[PDB]
Design a binder for these strands. Sequence first.
RNA 1: GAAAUGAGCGGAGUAUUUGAGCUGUGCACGGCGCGCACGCACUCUUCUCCGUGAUGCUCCAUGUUGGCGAUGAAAUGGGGUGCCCCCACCCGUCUUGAAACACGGACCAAGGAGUCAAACAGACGCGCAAGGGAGGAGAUAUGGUUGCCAGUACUUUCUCGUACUGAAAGGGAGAUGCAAAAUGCAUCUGUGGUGUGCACACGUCAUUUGCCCAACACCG
RNA 2: UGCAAGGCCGGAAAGAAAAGAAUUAGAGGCACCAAGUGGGCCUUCUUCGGUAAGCGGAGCAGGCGAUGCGGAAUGAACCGC
RNA 3: UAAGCCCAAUUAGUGAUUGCCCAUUAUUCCUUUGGUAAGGGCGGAAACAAAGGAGAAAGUGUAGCCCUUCCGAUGUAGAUGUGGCCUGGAGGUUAGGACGAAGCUUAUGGCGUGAGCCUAAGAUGGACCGGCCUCUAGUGCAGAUCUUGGUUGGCGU
Lengths: 130, 197, 140, 227, 52, 144, 68, 53, 77
Amino acid sequence: VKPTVSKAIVKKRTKRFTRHRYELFPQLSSSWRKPRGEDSPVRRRYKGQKAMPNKGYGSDRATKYITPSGFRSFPINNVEDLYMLVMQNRKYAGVISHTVGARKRKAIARKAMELDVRLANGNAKLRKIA
Amino acid sequence: GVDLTGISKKSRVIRHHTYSTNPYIKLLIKLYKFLAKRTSSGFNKVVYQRLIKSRSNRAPISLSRIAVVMKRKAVFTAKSKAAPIAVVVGDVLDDVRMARIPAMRVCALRFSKSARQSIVAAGGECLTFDQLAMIAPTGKNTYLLRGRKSGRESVRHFGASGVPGSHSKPYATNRGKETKRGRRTGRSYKRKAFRHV
Amino acid sequence: SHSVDLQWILVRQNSRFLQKRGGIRMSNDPFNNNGNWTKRHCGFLNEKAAVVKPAKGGAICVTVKDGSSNNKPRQTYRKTVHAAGVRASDVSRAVAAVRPDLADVSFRRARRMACIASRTAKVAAARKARSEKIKFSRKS
Amino acid sequence: AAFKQQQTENFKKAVVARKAAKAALKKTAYLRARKYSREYRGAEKKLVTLRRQAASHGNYYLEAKPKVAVVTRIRGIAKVNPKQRKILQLLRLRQIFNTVFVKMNKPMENMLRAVEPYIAYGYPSLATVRAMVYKRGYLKINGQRVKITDNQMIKDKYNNADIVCAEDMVNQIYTCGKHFRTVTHGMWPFKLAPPAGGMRQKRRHFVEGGDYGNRDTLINRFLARMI
Amino acid sequence: NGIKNRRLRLRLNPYVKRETAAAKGMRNVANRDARRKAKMARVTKAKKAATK
Amino acid sequence: PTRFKKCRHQRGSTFCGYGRVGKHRKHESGRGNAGGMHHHRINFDKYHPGYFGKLGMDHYHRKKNPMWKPTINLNNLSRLIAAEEAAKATKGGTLPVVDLQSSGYAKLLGNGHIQVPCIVKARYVSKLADKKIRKAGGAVVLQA
Amino acid sequence: AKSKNHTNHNQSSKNHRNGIKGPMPLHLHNSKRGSWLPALVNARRVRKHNQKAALKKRRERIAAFAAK
Amino acid sequence: PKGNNAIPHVHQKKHWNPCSSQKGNVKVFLNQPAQKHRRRRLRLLKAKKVFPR
Amino acid sequence: PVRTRTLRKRICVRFEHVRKSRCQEAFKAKEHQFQAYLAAKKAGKALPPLKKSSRMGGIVRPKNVEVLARRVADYEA
RNA sequence: GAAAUGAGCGGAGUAUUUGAGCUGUGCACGGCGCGCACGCACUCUUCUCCGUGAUGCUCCAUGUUGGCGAUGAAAUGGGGUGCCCCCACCCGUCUUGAAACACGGACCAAGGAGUCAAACAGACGCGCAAGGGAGGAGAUAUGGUUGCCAGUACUUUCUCGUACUGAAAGGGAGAUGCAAAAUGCAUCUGUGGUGUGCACACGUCAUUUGCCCAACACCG
RNA sequence: UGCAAGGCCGGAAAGAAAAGAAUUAGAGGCACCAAGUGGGCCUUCUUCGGUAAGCGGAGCAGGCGAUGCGGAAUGAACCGC
RNA sequence: UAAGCCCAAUUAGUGAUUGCCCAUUAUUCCUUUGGUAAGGGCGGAAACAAAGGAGAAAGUGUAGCCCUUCCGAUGUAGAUGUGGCCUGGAGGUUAGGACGAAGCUUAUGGCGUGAGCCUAAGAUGGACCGGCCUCUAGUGCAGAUCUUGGUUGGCGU
Ligand SMILES: *O[C@H]1[C@H](O)[C@@H](N)[C@@H](O[C@H]2[C@H](O[C@@H]3O[C@H](CO)[C@@H](O[C@H]4O[C@@H](CN)[C@@H](O)[C@H](O)[C@H]4N)[C@H]3O)[C@@H](O)[C@H](N)C[C@@H]2N)O[C@@H]1CO
Ligand SMILES: NC[C@@H]1O[C@H](O[C@H]2[C@@H](O)[C@H](O[C@@H]3[C@@H](O)[C@H](N)C[C@H](N)[C@H]3O[C@H]3O[C@H](CO)[C@@H](O)[C@H](O)[C@H]3N)O[C@@H]2CO)[C@H](N)[C@@H](O)[C@@H]1O
Ligand SMILES: [Mg+2]
Ligand SMILES: [Mg+2]
Ligand SMILES: [Mg+2]
Ligand SMILES: [Mg+2]
Ligand SMILES: [Mg+2]
């Protein structure tokens, strides 16, 4: 398949909303925690500070969730889950799960060329010829 | 940049969906939300909006109350017309205190086992809202009733009970406990049973 | 008695067929022409139903559930295999007799099954063409 | 197709009915806007005659005191006293550079005296009204703010059979008429741009060398930099 | 827009094709110059006759 | 269910809905109904008026079995008559006999209209219940 | 130690958030209890006639319906 | 802030639960179905013991 | 008005501490003018004429002119 | 150009009716004790008409001219490290106010704080409803079975409520009509009455009325 | 036959003219449940004690507290927003 | 011969408008999100094989049933909502794993506003475990002169 197309992917922000002042502390994760500090410069929204996640940063819903190939991603675990993506084929792409073994990925990658269903993590070498 | 000071205070609480988990109320809300928009009848507007309401706000009606207000409308009905279909969005309970009743046709959201019997034994009929969507689908010749919310215990406890004018009931598991000071004139004062406005 | 509108309230958040992966809600129903978890497209509780499937070689099977024999689970889905090179507008009418609201989707499904069986037989004319090499331990 | 044929045979009648009502309202807006233009050009000639008959014999023509004022808000929403803040709500001036047409009677002037540091008002011309109604005039239809695009949408709004086109609204605004209130309560408050070229001083009256207060027809060149 | 776009100014006021056509034979320098030749003879005549 | 609790929501908000100025502290107003006449006098007078005092005689060793006297009205006597037997009941004919003390209801009272004439066997009865069942067509028979 | 005694600063701004709720009309809560009593007992004599006139008028409105 | 709540009278001031310092004074019915079964098992063992009275 | 509400106080005074109020005087005046009119329209025809506004644009005949000029002798006071 | 709604793209023509002039006749205006600067009434300048619903419920797909790109790279991103110009006070906390010369704070891992029970209350979910529901205990499927099974299924006075009030002895609430008896009499299809008051029934206009449900107010 | 009161019946009703003769981003009226707070502080103006105070205490409003952003080089509170 | 003070202009007795520089303001154009939100469509119109395409759910809330339109949006203490995320166990369903599960690692990208989820590579591991609907709780750390273990600069002082 070739993906269905739409307008260009805008992505209001590509920078991660990381935590305030996490770089100075090896404990602190980069996952966002909201400041409740009463004198916090990020919370009080100063000029030179990090931004905070907000409803305005949300993504264009016509183009939301689609990967850079042009496909939404549906995680599959075996061969019978390719059969859901037959009509929904130029919209969704298969993502073979990590715990699926190397033996069962042959059966999935053979039929996903037969049945013409894009896998996001499989048979990219073979899809390049045909 | 707009000076919208008292603009959140103009907002009210509407709640377009129901909180109920019943799958048969959700089918009547499927049916009467269809009829509310696709018909100019104010019946289906009110019957849809009263079906969303909570179980406390769907207070039940008694069968002797249906038999009196249908009587006082059949007094000034020409007797060539039959009678309306009484419709309550709520429960019909039986009334022991009214033995004989006419043959009336009642659509309720649930009947008692005994309110169902005394309707059909009087020559009447217990309907339901899918069955009312077929005969009179817009509410032609109906009589929409509610059921009484005053007289509840909770409504009788709403108030201060010791400010003047208030005859609400105190929250007391013991009845003879809160009866002395502030409730008898000999025990230093008694709250005034009447206050203007 | 128990209508389809009531059966849809009972199974919409929990079913064997739902398959809510990610946030997609793609139905695993084998009587579903679309894969969507919608009410029109699930054929296991709709009182009449019609799915179009593959068949022997390149033929196009049509499994129809008429409303008559839902009481019996082994007599309720009747299958009718068309020709091998069947015209796909005819497969649409073979399901638009039972349910006309699955007419546009089943044309696209029957046209999809003719593109696949032409391609499944196309990628095996190259896979067996690649497979002339000394291999070990054939199975039978 | 037995049900679907009667729908498109009824849709066929509603197409020729909107095509008739479009050209019927095109004529009675072409005809009614000619009547008003004769009045705007002819009554303007009458006062040029009376002011020469006055000046020739040494007399004076006291012109009629203006009945319509255009009122724009020039200061923002911060630090406003509750008497001044309520009048700015009752004039529908809730944001900076919102503009409203008001009548110029004694109840309205004594509301405009009480909020002068926040507003700049004056006396509009015919072109100031029709530039504000055409370019930046919108309507309150179904509780929503929709822009004037055709005279059918105006005639659907007022339902008055006297206000059928966009020249009816600039008529009732410019010359007060029986329906000044229904036309102006029909429209949304006009939201203008800031003036090009600037403002001289927001904080002082127009006589003091600044911007607020009354401009005895000079408000047209100030609004002509905003519309 | 609506004072500068061509078809929205005419959708609202069909008489604007007459108002603009009236204001072309007013800006015209042939009509203009023999309009001030007459208005400086119609007004001054009624001026000198109302002072007698 | 702990997962439905307000604790799980304000988890991470470091004051748990008690505030920065005045904290959540152990018994800031007393333990129990302390201060009913002192610092909670406005609460105890407004909502719970007739508290705080004495009233009436002292019944030492009350027995609630001899002061047993339940109550039924005339309009609720259909609760005790079987549905087979009210329809055969006509004034001047054979009426059903209702034995009240076998049902609770030591005293008959006379509220409302009696919907079926019957012979009531009651331990007690009132003026307006005796008056009103002899005119309806039944009677009242005393029992012990 | 010493603090701020008495202030009326925020209160007029607090009193107008949910408004000054205006007075209620003169047909609501117009109880005549506590009024001058010889004219209160007189008006009870009249309302006990106006109720039985209203019982008789409605009963007369029914016989003017069962005959027409 | 206390409101229009009932005056509590809950009667639990006498060291009833087993904490680290108190043995407790507490009686739980977790053996209710096993003593239910025991009395019946012991009435069927007794009805054999007396038979046929 | 007390805090957020306007409650209705029922005071009781002696009769010398009340005057009858002329608050509705201007409303009973234009009410009885609406039975003065409608008694001249349905039956007769004689009406007092409607009053024209003084805010219209008339011509001014100057019967006296001055010059407002701030003379020098206006300062010596 | 995947419905180009145009003074603009089309058709069909030589004119259409907007102003400017110059005007008639009434009125209105301006002076007096005849004027009208052409207000209201009935030759110059300009393009004027009719056109196409959606049989499309929604979304997405169609130019031109180079440069790069020949299956070993090109191209957009993402990530990594520096740099430039700019911006930027240390976090948590109490406080009117903390970047503070105010407290706590070297690093990391792992633990680490609104829980459970009891009594009421309100909101909401569910069952039954003038009734509701146990609890304790029996019973036998089970007098079975390692276990499942301490569960499930089944069965009966007690409690809350239908009636309140009085310190107690005690007493104990329907409507209507006739009517005035210190327990009045007769009816038993019935809102105690008045004001406001969804839906609905019959007319009217671009709501009149009837009944009023729930509710409020005033009474009885 | 007047007066006061509560009803009943019929009438009229610019739904409020004209005189500057209102306006409204004007859904009105009820009720339940419950937080946090109950140390404030600054300012134009009025003001009290004080020699005065970045002092103490009030009045009407607006602010900071709780809030940045653009300006006064810097400044919780000023100017703009 | 101000880059100072007081007045005054806007390209200068030339013929009429607004010298220009800077905002989280204003106007307008996009996108998001929420409404006391407001409207429309949802009886598959006909027709169409491979060698113009897919969707269309009567709907609080989703990867929102699909479109069109309008307005609002910051906030401590606080309240609330969330087919909002995460952890241990239980009832059901659907699947993974010696062709390599949990765990660990990261210039492994992807996408979600975010909490987070998922893929890839380990020249890591060596046997268990995921997703969805419900049920349950000893369920989320950055600081308590926090507890216990280890480490570190001071310092080869
Ligand atoms: O029942 C009383 C009521 O509680 C009380 N508010 C008042 O009603 C006012 C009315 O005030 C609105 O009432 C709404 C809720 O009761 C409220 O709206 C706002 O409430 C908040 C939370 N309750 C917010 O969540 C939200 O901003 C908004 N819904 C008030 O705006 C006024 O609007 C009326 N003008 C006058 C009423 N008296 O009085 C009731 C009387 O008991
Ligand atoms: N009076 C006309 C009728 O009144 C009916 O309502 C009447 C009664 O049904 C109703 O009485 C209710 C009672 O039903 C319910 N079970 C208990 C409730 N407390 C009572 O309410 C009434 O009675 C108490 C008595 O002190 C009063 O204090 C209270 O103000 C009053 N609302 O209140 C009215 C009594 O005057 C209906 N609204 C309607 O049929 C009709 O309009
Ligand atoms: Mg004593
Ligand atoms: Mg503070
Ligand atoms: Mg009770
Ligand atoms: Mg907070
Ligand atoms: Mg813990």
